[PDB]
Amino acid sequence: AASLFLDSISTFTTYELFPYDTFIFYTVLTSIISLDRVSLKQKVVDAPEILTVIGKIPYLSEFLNSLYDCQYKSFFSAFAGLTEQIKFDRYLHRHFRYYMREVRTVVYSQFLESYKSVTIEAMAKAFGVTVEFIDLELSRFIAAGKLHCKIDKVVGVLETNRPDAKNALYQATIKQGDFLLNRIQKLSRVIDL
Amino acid sequence: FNRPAEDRTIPLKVIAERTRLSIEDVEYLLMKSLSVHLIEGIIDQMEGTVHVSWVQPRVLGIPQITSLRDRLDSWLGKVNTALLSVEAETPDLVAS
Amino acid sequence: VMDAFRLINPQTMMLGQEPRQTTSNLGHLNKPSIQALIHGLNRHYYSIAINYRKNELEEKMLLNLHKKKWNDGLTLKKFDVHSKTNEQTVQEMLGLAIKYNKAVQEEDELTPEKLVIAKVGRQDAKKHLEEHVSNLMSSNIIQTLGTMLDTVIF
Amino acid sequence: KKFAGTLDQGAGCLIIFDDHKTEDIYEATLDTISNVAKVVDSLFVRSAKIMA
Amino acid sequence: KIAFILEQVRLCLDRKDYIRAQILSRKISPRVFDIDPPSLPELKRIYYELMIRYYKHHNDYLEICRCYKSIYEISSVKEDPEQWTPILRKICWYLALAPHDPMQSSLLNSTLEDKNLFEIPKFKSLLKQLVTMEVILWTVLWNEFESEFDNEKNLLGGPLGEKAGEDLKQRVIEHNILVISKYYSRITLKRLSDLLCLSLQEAEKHLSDMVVSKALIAKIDRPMGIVCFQVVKDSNDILNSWSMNLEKLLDLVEKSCHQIHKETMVHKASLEV
Amino acid sequence: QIFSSKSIEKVVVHPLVLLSIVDHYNRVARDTKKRVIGVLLGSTFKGTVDVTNSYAVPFEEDDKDSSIWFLDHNYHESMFSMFRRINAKEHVVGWYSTGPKLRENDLDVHRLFSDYVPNPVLVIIDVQPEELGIPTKAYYAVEEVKENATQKSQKVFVHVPSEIAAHEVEEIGVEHLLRDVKDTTISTLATEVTGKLGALKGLDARLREIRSYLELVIQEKLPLNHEILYHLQDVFNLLPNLSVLELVKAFAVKTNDMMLVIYLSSLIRSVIALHNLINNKMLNKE
């Protein structure tokens, strides 16, 4: 999707996508997942392209820049708007539940990597309200095996760690090694009777 | 020399009591006998330990010969168990 | 390449007689060189069959010659260099793999074996893949043996 | 995401913590996945051939 | 030709036009003098005498040091002590006045080897004290050599410079610190401030520059006051040494390996009589 | 600055030399325990002694008086002239001994021979090798001045590395001789594992021999040269601590990385082998 981002920057308006501003906004929803913020500085060059096209959009300009300007609390306000729009839109509605849970975990860990450990009651009034809402949400993502930190409970603090890119890089290898050997062992039974 | 090569880390304190000599001066003596090419090693101040890569080879008698006897019997046994493991693993594997 | 020769008496040749009597077929075992047939073989001279007398002690010492130093197995490769060779060979396996995927896919029903022998993908993606996996396995696993038999015995 | 660095919430504790290790392993798994996918391609094609 | 361009660089230096002086001095390739036949050995002498003045402006203690060797290598100077006597003395400082450098390290080695420096034992101690990996306490060295330093104000070439005393104060720091890192891996900044006879901030500062200069790889933990001089070794970096140690152990025993039968061979023969 | 005589760094011993020496021993000493001696011919380059050719030089040594040893120089110099005529490139390089052990008169042989070469090399070749290794051991005489005053300067033979390499022609002849035995299809591992295992048989037996000699010193039969006992203590001193914890994680990391590379290799071989099996099924059905 992010590949054709530059492709859309240079393409044209067909009968399907007559609105350049609409094609422009589409190339932005997939970019905020696919690339990090050195590539989001590449996306700020895409945002000078947005002063060219998303300057006509008050919604998408505020939605993209709130992640870049670290305006964390207003980030969820338009994220509720986009995700609702993502449901009623065709072709994103097969995966609208997969989008935001990747955008939540990208908005969480961006703030958390910015400290060795910040208390858990600071994120209510600055990032999104509901302390126990943050509690049940961070508990289900560390248990999901991502979002590298470790939350405490009764002294009311969130601690981070830093793991190497070895254990997590080893994890995706053993999935694919099992998957390909599942493919070839099942194949060799099928052929030769 | 008394210590083995596996424990060439020694606290500066013990060096002091053996030398009855102050921390600053113990360190002075250490860096001097490391500088003269008498010794080679490292010294860690945080816990105050001396990692010498400094070991010599001479001056020993019949008792150290008997100690090396025990050590060589030990390593002969170690080699024996390694060889026996290899020989026990081979039959199921070279016959294929 | 060596041969022995002795001359055929010209008087016997002028008489039309066979220069020698053959109770054994050993002399005919080696087919003579057509050059020698051009250079007067069996008209002025003849060949002599050659064998080699070899002493057992000579064979023991000869076998000793090619025996590598028993320490050479101990000489382990530097870990950094060995790892870089592994890296490069892995990238080579990547390149050969993509080439071979194209080769298997582009292959049509009428695949010309003669044309493939004359020119194949990356010389021959399959052959290089096999040789590279063989060499990679060998190097890694010999390094394995070396490091750890040292671990045990040292 | 420039040069490493990450101060604590208010204790002054940078979280810059990383190492440089290009791994044969990740490219290796990519190779294996692509090669196995094409093995399955050949298997399905030649199975279609046997049933024919 | 060379004399004319030498007068030219002299006038430019008198004008303090240093850039033109360098642009011109680069023209004279030192190889022209080395051609076997004021005359050339005297034209030789002034040539470096001019550049010493030029480099003296730039605090290029390194290059200034090489100038005097070539003045030293003059046969006429080498023959009579009254010239090679003061000049070798001058060589002793500039080597010490030059910062720690690989070429600086090697030239010291050549300088110690000279037969001449034996006749200058006291300064030979310096070049040994700087060559030998001795941690030099500043006070013990300086107190003796404050007097010998002051005497150089009266010798040919002028004073060594007011900044030299404070600038020399670094090379012993540089000399000791290199010894420190090699004989200390994790030093308390206090103890470094102690061992560097300096404050924590200066002691740290002399370090901060050195990691900045790349002269040493180290990491300070101001919250802990810990200077670790060891590069973070990757497991392979740990291991590479390890098997290297064993490969020596293998070789070591493999040397002791043959050493043992040979004595059996030699000894058993002595028992055959 | 006294040692202007180029130290002999290494000696390369080629097959033809060994074959000639073995034939000499057989002809002269097939049925006697007499050793056969000869002269070594070749060129020395950059501290390396190229021992190209050798010739039989008949030898006797009294079985009663080892100090007495019948070797003469007439034929020696005659062959120097004659061979050098044949091949001017070669010159004498050493004298070889056919036996398992040195004898004291080897020193006087070396002394007499050094008149022909300022730096001669003594090579001992075991005509009937029992040990797994190179059958040649190189030596050169060094005037060692012991720190003890009461003994005059003693010439002691110092071991030098000896190596076996065969010229292209000699290599050709060797393989032509060794086809009925030799192995080139050995996958490198079989060779390397065999060599490591032989080395383990070497070092542990060497430790046991040192232990036997230490028990000997305890009983009080044999003492020891300070230098060699020094060397054994040195080996023990340089013993790394196999229980180093961070070093243990270093092992674990390298093991994981290498074995997962091997895992790559096994996966890829799976790919190719299954592909070829399917093609074999195709060829069999067609």
Short mmCIF file of C-alpha atoms in Angstrom, two decimals, chain A residues 165-166 168-174 176-177, chain C residues 87 90-91 94, chain D residues 21-34, chain F residues 256-257 260-261 264:
data_model
loop_
_atom_site.label_atom_id
_atom_site.label_comp_id
_atom_site.label_asym_id
_atom_site.label_seq_id
_atom_site.Cartn_x
_atom_site.Cartn_y
_atom_site.Cartn_z
CA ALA A 165 16.70 -7.47 18.13
CA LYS A 166 17.63 -11.12 18.60
CA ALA A 168 12.10 -11.06 18.65
CA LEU A 169 13.92 -11.64 15.37
CA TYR A 170 14.33 -15.31 16.29
CA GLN A 171 10.59 -15.60 16.93
CA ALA A 172 9.44 -14.92 13.37
CA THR A 173 12.04 -17.35 12.01
CA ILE A 174 10.69 -20.35 13.91
CA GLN A 176 8.29 -19.68 8.98
CA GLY A 177 10.57 -22.68 9.45
CA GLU C 87 26.73 -14.20 5.11
CA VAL C 90 23.69 -17.00 2.11
CA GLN C 91 23.17 -13.95 -0.10
CA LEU C 94 19.27 -15.90 -2.29
CA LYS D 21 24.28 -7.16 13.95
CA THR D 22 23.11 -7.63 10.33
CA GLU D 23 21.92 -11.28 10.55
CA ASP D 24 22.34 -14.00 7.96
CA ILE D 25 19.29 -15.51 9.66
CA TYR D 26 16.53 -13.16 8.52
CA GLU D 27 17.56 -13.21 4.88
CA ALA D 28 17.98 -16.97 5.35
CA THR D 29 14.37 -17.41 6.44
CA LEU D 30 13.23 -15.24 3.53
CA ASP D 31 15.16 -17.49 1.14
CA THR D 32 13.61 -20.61 2.66
CA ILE D 33 10.08 -19.19 2.54
CA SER D 34 10.34 -18.22 -1.12
CA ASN F 256 22.44 -20.51 17.99
CA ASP F 257 23.64 -18.45 15.02
CA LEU F 260 20.34 -21.70 12.47
CA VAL F 261 22.57 -21.10 9.46
CA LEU F 264 18.87 -22.61 6.49
#
